PDB file of C-alpha atoms and ligand atoms in Angstrom:
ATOM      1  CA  UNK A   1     113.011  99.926 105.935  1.00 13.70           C
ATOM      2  CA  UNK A   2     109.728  99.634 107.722  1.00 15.16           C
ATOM      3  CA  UNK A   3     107.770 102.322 110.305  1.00 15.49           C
ATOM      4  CA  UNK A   4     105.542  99.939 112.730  1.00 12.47           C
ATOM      5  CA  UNK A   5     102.074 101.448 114.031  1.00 10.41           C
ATOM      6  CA  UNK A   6     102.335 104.400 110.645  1.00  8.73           C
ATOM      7  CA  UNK A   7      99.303 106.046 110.083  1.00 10.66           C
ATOM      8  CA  UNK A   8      96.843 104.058 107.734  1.00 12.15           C
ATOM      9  CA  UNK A   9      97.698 105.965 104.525  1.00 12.30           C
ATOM     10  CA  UNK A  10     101.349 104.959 104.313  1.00 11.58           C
ATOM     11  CA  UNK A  11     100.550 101.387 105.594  1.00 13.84           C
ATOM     12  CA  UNK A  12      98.078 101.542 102.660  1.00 14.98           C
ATOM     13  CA  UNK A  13     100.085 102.959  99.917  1.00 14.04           C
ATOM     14  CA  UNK A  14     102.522 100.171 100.646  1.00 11.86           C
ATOM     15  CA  UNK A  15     100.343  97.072 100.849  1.00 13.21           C
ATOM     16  CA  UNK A  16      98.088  94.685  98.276  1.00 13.19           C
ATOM     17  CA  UNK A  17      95.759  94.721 100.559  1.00 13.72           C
ATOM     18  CA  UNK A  18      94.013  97.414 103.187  1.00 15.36           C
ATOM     19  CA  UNK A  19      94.283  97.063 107.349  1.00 13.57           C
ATOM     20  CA  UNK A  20      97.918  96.417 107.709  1.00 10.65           C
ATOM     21  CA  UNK A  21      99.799  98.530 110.071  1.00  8.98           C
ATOM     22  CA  UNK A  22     103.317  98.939 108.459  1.00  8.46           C
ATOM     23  CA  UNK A  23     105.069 101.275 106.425  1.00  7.67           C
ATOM     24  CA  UNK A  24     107.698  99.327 103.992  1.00  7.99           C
ATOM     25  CA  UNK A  25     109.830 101.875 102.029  1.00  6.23           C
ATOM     26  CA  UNK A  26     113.376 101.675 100.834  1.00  7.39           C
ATOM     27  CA  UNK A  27     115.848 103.373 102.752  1.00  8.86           C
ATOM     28  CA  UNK A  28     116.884 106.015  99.824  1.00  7.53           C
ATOM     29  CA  UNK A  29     113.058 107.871 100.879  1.00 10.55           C
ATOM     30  CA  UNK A  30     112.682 110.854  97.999  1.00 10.63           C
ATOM     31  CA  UNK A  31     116.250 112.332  98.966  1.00 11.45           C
ATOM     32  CA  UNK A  32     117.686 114.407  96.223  1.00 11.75           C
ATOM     33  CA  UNK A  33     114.122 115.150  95.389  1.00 14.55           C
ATOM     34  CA  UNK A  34     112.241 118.117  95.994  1.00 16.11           C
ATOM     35  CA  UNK A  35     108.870 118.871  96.667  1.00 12.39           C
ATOM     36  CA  UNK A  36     106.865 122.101  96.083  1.00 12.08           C
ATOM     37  CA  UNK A  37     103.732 122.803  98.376  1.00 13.06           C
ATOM     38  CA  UNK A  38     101.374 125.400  96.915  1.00 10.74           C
ATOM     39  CA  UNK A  39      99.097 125.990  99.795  1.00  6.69           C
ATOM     40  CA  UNK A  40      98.383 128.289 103.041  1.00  8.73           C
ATOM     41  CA  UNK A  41     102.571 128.096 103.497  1.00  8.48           C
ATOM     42  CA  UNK A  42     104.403 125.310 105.775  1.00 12.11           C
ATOM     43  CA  UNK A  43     105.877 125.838 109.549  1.00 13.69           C
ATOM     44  CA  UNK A  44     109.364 125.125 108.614  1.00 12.11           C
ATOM     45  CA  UNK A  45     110.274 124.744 112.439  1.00 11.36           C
ATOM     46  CA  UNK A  46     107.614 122.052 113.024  1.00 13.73           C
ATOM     47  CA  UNK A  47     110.552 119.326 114.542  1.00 11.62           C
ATOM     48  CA  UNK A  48     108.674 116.745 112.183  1.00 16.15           C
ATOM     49  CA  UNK A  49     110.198 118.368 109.249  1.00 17.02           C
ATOM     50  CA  UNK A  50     114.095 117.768 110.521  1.00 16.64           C
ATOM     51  CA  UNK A  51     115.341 121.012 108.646  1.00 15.65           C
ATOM     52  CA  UNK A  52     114.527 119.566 105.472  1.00 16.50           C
ATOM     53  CA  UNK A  53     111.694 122.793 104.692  1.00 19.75           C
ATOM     54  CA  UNK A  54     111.503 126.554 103.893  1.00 19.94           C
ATOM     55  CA  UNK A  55     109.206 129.002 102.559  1.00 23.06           C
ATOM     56  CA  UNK A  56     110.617 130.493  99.108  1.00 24.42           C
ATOM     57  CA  UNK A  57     107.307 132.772  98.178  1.00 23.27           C
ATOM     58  CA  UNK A  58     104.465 134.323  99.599  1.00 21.64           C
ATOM     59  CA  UNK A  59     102.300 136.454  98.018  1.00 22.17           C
ATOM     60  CA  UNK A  60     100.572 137.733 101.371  1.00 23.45           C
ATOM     61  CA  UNK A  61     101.940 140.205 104.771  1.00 26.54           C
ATOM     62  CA  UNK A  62     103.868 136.940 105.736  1.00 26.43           C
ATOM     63  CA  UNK A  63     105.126 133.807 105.052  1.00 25.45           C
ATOM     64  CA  UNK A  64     103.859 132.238 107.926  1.00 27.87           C
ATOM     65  CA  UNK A  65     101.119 129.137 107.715  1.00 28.04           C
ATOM     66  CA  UNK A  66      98.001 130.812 109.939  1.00 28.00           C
ATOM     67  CA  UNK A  67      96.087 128.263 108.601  1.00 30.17           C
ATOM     68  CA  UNK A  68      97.299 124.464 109.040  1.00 30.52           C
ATOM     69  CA  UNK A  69      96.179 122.920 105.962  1.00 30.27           C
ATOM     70  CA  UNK A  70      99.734 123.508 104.517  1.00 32.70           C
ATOM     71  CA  UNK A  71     101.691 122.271 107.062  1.00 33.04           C
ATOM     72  CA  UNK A  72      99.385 119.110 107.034  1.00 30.54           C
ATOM     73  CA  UNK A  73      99.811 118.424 103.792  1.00 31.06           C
ATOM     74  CA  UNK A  74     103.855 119.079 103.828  1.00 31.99           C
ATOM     75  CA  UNK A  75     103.796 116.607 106.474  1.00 28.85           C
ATOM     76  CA  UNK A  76     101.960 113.754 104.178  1.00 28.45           C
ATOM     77  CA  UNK A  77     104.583 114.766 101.516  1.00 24.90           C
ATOM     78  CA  UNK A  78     107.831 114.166 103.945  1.00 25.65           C
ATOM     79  CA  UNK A  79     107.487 114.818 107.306  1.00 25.82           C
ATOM     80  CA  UNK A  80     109.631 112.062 109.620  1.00 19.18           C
ATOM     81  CA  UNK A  81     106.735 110.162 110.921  1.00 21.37           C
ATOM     82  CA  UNK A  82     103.502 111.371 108.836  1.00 21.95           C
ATOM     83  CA  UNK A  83     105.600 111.416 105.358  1.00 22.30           C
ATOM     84  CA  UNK A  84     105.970 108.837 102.011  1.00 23.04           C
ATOM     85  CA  UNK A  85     109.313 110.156 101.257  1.00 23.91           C
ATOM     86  CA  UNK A  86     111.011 111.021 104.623  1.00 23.36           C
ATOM     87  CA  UNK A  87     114.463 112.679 103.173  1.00 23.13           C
ATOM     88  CA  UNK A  88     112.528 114.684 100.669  1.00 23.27           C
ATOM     89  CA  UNK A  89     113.670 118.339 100.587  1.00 22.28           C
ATOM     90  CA  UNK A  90     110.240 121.219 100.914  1.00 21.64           C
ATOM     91  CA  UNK A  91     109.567 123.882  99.596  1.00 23.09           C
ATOM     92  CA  UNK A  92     106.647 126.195 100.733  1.00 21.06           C
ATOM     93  CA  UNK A  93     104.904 128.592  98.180  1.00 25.22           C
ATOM     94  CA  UNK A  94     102.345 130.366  99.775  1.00 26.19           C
ATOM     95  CA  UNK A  95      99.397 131.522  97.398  1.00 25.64           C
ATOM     96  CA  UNK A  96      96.467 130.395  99.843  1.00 22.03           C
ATOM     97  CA  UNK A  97      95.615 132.768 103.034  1.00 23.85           C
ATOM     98  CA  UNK A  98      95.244 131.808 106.771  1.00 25.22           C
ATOM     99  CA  UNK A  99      91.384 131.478 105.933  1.00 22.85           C
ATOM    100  CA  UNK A 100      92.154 128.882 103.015  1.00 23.86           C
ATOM    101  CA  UNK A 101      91.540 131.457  99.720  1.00 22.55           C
ATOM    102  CA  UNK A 102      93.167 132.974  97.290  1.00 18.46           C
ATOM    103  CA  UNK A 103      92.346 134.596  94.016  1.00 14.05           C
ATOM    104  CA  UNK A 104      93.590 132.346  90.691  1.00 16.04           C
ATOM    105  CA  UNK A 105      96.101 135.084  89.725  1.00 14.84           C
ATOM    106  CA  UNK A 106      97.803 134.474  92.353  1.00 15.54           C
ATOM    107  CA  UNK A 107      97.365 130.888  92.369  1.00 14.37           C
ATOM    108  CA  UNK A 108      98.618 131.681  88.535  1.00 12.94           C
ATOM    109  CA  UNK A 109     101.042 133.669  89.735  1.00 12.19           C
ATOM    110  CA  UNK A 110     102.553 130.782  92.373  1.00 14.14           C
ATOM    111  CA  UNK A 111     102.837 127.425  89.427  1.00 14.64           C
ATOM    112  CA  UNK A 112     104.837 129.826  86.858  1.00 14.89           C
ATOM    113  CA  UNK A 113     107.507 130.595  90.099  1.00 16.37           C
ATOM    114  CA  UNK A 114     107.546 127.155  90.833  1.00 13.81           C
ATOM    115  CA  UNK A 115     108.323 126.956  86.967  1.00 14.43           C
ATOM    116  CA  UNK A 116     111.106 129.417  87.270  1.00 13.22           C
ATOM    117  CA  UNK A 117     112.479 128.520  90.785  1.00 13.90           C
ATOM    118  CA  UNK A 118     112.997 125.103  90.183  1.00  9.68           C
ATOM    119  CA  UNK A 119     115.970 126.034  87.964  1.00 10.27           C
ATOM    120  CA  UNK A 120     118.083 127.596  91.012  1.00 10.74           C
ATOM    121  CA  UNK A 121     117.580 124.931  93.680  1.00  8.10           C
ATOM    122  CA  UNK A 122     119.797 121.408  93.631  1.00 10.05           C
ATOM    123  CA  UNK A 123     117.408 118.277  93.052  1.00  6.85           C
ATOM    124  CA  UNK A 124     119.301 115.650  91.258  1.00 11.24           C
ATOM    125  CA  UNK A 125     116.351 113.394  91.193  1.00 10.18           C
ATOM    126  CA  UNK A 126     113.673 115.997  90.561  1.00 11.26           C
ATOM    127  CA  UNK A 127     110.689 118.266  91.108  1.00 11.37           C
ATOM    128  CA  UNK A 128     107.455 117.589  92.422  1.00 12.24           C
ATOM    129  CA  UNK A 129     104.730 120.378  92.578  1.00 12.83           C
ATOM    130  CA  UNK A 130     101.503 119.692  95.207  1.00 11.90           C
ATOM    131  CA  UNK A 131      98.406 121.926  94.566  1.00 11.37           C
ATOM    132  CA  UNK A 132      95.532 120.188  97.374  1.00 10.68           C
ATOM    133  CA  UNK A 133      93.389 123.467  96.201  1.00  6.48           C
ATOM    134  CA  UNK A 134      90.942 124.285  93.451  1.00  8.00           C
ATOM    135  CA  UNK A 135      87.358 125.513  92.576  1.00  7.87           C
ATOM    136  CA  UNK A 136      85.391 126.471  89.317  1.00 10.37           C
ATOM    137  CA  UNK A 137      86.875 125.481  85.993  1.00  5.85           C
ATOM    138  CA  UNK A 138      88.791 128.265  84.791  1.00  4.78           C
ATOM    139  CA  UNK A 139      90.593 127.476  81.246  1.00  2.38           C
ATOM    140  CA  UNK A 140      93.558 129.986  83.109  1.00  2.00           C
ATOM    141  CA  UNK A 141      94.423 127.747  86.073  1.00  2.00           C
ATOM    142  CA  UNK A 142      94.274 124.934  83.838  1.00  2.00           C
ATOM    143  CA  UNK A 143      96.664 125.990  81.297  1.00  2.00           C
ATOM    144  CA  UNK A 144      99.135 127.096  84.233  1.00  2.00           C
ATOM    145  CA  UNK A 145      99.254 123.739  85.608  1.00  2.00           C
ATOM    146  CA  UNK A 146      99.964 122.618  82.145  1.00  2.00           C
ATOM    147  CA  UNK A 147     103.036 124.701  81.603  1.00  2.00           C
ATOM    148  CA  UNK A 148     104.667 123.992  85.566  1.00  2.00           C
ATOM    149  CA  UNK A 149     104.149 120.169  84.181  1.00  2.00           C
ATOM    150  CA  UNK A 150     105.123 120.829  80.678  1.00  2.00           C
ATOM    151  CA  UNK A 151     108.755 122.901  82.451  1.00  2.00           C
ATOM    152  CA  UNK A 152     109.565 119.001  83.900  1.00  2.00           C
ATOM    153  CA  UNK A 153     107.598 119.204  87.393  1.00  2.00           C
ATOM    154  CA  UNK A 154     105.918 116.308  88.313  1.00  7.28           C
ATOM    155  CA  UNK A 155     102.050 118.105  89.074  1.00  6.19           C
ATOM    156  CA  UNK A 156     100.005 116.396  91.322  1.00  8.39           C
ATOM    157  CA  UNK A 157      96.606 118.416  91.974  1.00 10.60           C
ATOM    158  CA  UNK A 158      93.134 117.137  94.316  1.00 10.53           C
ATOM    159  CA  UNK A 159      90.376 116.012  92.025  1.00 10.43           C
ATOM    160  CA  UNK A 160      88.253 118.145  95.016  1.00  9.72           C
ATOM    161  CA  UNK A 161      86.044 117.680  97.895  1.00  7.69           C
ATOM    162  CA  UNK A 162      82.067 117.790  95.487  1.00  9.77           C
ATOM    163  CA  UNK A 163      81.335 114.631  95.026  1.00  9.27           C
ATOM    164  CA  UNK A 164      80.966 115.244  91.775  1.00  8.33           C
ATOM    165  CA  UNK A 165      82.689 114.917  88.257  1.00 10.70           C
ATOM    166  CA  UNK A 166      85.758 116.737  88.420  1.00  7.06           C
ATOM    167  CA  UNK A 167      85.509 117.907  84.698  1.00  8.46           C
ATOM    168  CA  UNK A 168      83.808 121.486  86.123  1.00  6.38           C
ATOM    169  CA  UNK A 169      86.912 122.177  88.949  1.00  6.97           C
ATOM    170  CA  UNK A 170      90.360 123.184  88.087  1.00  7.14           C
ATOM    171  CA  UNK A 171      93.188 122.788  88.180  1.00  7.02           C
ATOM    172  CA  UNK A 172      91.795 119.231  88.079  1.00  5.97           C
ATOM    173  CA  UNK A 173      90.028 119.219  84.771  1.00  8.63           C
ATOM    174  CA  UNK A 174      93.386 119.774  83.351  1.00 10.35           C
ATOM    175  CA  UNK A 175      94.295 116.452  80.841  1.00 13.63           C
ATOM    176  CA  UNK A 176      98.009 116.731  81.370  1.00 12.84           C
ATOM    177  CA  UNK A 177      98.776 116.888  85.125  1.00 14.00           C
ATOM    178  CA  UNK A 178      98.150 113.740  87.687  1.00 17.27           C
ATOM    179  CA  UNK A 179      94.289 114.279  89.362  1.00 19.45           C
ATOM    180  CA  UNK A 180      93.920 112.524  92.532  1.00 20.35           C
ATOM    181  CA  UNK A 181      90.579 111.353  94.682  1.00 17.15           C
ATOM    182  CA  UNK A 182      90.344 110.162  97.538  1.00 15.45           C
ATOM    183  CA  UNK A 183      89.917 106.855  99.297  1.00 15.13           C
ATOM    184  CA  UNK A 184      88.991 105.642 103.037  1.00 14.11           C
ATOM    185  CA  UNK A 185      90.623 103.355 104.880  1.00 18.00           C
ATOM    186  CA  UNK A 186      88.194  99.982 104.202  1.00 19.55           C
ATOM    187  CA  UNK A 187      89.238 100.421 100.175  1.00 21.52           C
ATOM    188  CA  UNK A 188      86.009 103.202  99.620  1.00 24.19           C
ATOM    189  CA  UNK A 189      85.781 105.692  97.466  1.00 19.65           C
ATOM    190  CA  UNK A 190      86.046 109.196 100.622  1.00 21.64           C
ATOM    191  CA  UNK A 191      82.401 109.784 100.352  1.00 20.12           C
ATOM    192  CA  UNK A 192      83.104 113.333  99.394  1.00 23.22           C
ATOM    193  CA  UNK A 193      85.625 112.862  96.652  1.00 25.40           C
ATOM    194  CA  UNK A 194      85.500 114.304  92.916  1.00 22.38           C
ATOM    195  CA  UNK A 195      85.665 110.999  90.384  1.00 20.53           C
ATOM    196  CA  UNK A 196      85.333 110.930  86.633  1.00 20.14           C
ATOM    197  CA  UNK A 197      86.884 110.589  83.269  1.00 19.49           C
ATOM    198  CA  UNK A 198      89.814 112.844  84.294  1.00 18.20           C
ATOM    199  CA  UNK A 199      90.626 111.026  87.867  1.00 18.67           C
ATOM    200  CA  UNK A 200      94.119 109.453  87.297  1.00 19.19           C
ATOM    201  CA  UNK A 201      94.748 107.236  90.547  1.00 18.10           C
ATOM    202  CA  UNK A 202      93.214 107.302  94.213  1.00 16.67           C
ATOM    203  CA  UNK A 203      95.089 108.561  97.214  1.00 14.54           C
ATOM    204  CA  UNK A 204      94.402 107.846 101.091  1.00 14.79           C
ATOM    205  CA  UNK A 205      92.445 111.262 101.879  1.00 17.63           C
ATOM    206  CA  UNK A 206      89.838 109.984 105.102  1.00 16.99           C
ATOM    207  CA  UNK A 207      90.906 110.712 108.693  1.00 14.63           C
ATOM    208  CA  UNK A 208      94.989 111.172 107.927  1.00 16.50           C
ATOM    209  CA  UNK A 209      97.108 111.804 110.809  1.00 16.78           C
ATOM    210  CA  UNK A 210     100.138 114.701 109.853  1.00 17.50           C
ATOM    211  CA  UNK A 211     101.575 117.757 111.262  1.00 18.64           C
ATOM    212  CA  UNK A 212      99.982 120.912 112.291  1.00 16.03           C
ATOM    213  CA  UNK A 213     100.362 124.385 113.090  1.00 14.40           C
ATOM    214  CA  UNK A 214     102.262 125.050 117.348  1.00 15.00           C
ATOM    215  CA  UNK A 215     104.200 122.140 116.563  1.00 16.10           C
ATOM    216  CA  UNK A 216     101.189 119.656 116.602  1.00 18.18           C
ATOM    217  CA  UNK A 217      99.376 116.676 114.959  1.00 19.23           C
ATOM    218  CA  UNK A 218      95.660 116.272 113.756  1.00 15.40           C
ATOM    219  CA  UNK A 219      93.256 113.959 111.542  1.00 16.33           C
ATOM    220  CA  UNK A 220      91.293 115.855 108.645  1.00 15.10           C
ATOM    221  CA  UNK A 221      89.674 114.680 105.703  1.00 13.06           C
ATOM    222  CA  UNK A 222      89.819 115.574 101.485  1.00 10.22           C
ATOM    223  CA  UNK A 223      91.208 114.822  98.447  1.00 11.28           C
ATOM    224  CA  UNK A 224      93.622 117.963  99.732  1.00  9.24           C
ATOM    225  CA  UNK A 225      95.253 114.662 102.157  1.00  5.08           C
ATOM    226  CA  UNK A 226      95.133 112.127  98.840  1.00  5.91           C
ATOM    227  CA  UNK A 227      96.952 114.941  96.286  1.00  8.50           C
ATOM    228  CA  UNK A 228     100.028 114.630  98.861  1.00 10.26           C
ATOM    229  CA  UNK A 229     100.308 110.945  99.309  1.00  7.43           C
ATOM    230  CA  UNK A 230     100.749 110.402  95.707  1.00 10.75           C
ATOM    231  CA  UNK A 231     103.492 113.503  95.304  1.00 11.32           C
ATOM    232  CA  UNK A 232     105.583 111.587  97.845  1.00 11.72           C
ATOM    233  CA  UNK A 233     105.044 108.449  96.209  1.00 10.47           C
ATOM    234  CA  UNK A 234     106.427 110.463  92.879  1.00 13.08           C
ATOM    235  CA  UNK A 235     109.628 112.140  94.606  1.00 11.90           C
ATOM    236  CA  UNK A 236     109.861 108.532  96.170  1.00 13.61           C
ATOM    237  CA  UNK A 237     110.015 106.325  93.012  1.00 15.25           C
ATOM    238  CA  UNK A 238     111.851 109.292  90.551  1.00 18.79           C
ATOM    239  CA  UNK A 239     114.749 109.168  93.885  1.00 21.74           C
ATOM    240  CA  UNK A 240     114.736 105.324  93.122  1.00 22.17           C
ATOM    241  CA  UNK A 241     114.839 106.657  89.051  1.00 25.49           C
ATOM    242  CA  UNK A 242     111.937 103.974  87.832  1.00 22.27           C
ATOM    243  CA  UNK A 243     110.021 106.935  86.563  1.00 21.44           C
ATOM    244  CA  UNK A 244     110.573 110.979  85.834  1.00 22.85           C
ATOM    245  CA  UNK A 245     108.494 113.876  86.142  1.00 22.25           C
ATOM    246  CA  UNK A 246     107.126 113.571  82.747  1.00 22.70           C
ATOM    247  CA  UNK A 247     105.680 110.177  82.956  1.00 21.73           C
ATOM    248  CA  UNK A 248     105.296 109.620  86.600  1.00 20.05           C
ATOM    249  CA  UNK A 249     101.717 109.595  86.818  1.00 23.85           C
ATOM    250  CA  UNK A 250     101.382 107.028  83.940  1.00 22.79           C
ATOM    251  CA  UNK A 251     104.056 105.097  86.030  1.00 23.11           C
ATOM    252  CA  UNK A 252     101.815 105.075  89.249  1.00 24.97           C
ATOM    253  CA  UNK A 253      98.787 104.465  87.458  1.00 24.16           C
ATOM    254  CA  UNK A 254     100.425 101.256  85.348  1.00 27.86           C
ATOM    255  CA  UNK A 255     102.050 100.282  89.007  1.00 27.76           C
ATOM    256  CA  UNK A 256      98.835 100.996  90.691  1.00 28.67           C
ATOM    257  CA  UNK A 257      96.560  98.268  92.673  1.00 26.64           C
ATOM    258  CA  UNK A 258      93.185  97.701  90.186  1.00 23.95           C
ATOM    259  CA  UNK A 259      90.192  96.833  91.163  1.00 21.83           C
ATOM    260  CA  UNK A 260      90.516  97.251  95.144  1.00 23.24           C
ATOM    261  CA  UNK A 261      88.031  99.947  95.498  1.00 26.53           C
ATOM    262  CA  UNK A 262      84.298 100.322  96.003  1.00 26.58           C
ATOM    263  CA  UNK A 263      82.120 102.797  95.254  1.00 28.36           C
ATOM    264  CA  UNK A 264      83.428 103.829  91.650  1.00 28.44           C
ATOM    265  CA  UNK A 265      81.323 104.816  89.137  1.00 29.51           C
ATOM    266  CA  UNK A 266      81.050 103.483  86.023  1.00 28.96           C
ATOM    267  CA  UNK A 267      84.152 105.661  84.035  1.00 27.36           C
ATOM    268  CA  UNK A 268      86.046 106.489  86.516  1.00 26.89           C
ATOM    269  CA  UNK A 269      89.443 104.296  87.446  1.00 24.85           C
ATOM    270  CA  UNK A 270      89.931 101.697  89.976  1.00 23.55           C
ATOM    271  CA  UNK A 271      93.574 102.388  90.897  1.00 23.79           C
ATOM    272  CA  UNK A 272      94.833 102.801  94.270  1.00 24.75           C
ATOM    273  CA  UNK A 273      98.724 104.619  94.717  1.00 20.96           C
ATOM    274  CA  UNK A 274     101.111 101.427  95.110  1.00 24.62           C
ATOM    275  CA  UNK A 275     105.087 101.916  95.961  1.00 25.20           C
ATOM    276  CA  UNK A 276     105.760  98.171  94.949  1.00 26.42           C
ATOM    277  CA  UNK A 277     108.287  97.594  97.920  1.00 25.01           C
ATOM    278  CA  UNK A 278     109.679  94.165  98.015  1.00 25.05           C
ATOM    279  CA  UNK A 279     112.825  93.641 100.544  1.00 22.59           C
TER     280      UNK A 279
HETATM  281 NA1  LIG B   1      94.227  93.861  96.418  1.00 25.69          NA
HETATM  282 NA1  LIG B   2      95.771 113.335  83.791  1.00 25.68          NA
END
């Protein structure tokens, strides 16, 4: 299957090289697979979505996203048009506000129900968890995204947004789960992402077009955009069953283009996210 004039991400994350304009995918595209977003909550009615999303949680007044950053970052994940794996089923777990914060207990609170959920919901293929979120390193958050990966959820979490050495953020600094920066779309390090030791692969994270809040569309920025591209790319390939949640990120990052970006300090990995499509 290919999607002519996609966005630059999925072009990217599909391609050897940057500046192509096409989407190449195989037809099967993450279904069986599910997806959790942790985040400000996904519009479930956004068209884009095809029925294929619902809110499960919220630990606010409503379920609703107020914000947009969820809804963006759902639509990276599996959206029709903006999406890596475009029959992927979403789930929305709100633990994020309509101003972007949240407290880490319930942040906490949201990765053990994803834990628990997982077990009553029908995904053959598997489960995906997507946290674009994080701040100061808290040993806590850390250890929670260890046990949602450690109950067979693929974790993919932002590396975040300091340009700085992710080892002080969590849940980033956390070993055991896949930590994603960001890249631009002439194969540079996003000037603002997180890199170091703990950095497992690079996502697409500058100026990505997905869905929005009213049933729109808009371009942001952050390793919030990257985190997304690469839990696609895992509901994608463990739908295809090359890889499963367990060793999915050490399947992406063997897969992975090397040595394609600039801009990488010494220590941190040259690996770009890579769906190996050949027709
Ligand atoms: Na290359
Ligand atoms: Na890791």
């Amino acid at each position: 299957a290919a999607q002519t004039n996609a966005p630059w991400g999925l072009a990217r994350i599909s391609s050897t090289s940057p500046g192509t304009s096409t989407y190449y995918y195989d037809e099967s595209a993450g279904q069986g697979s599910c997806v959790y977003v942790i985040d400000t909550g996904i519009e479930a009615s956004h068209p884009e979505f095809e029925g294929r999303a619902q809110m499960v949680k919220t630990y606010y007044y409503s379920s609703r996203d107020g914000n947009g950053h969820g809804t963006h970052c759902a639509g990276t994940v599996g959206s029709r048009t903006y999406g890596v794996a475009k029959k992927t089923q979403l789930f929305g777990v709100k633990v994020l506000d309509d101003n972007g914060s949240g407290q880490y207990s319930t942040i906490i609170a949201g990765m053990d129900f994803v834990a628990s959920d997982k077990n009553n919901r029908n995904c053959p293929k598997g489960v995906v968890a997507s946290l674009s979120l994080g701040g100061g390193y808290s040993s806590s958050v850390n250890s929670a995204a260890a046990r949602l990966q450690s109950s067979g959820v693929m974790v993919a979490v932002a590396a975040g947004n300091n340009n700085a050495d992710a080892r002080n953020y969590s849940p980033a600094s956390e070993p055991s789960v896949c930590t994603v920066g960001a890249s631009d779309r002439y194969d540079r390090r996003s000037s603002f992402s997180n890199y170091g030791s703990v950095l497992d692969i690079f996502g697409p994270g500058t100026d990505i077009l997905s869905t929005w809040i009213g049933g729109s569309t808009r371009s942001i920025s952050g390793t919030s955009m990257a985190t997304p591209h690469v839990a696609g790319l895992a509901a994608y390939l463990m739908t295809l069953g090359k890889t499963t949640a367990a060793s999915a990120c050490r399947y992406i990052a063997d897969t992975a283009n090397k040595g394609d970006l600039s801009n990488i300090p010494f220590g941190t990995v040259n690996l770009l996210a890579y769906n190996n499509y050949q027709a």
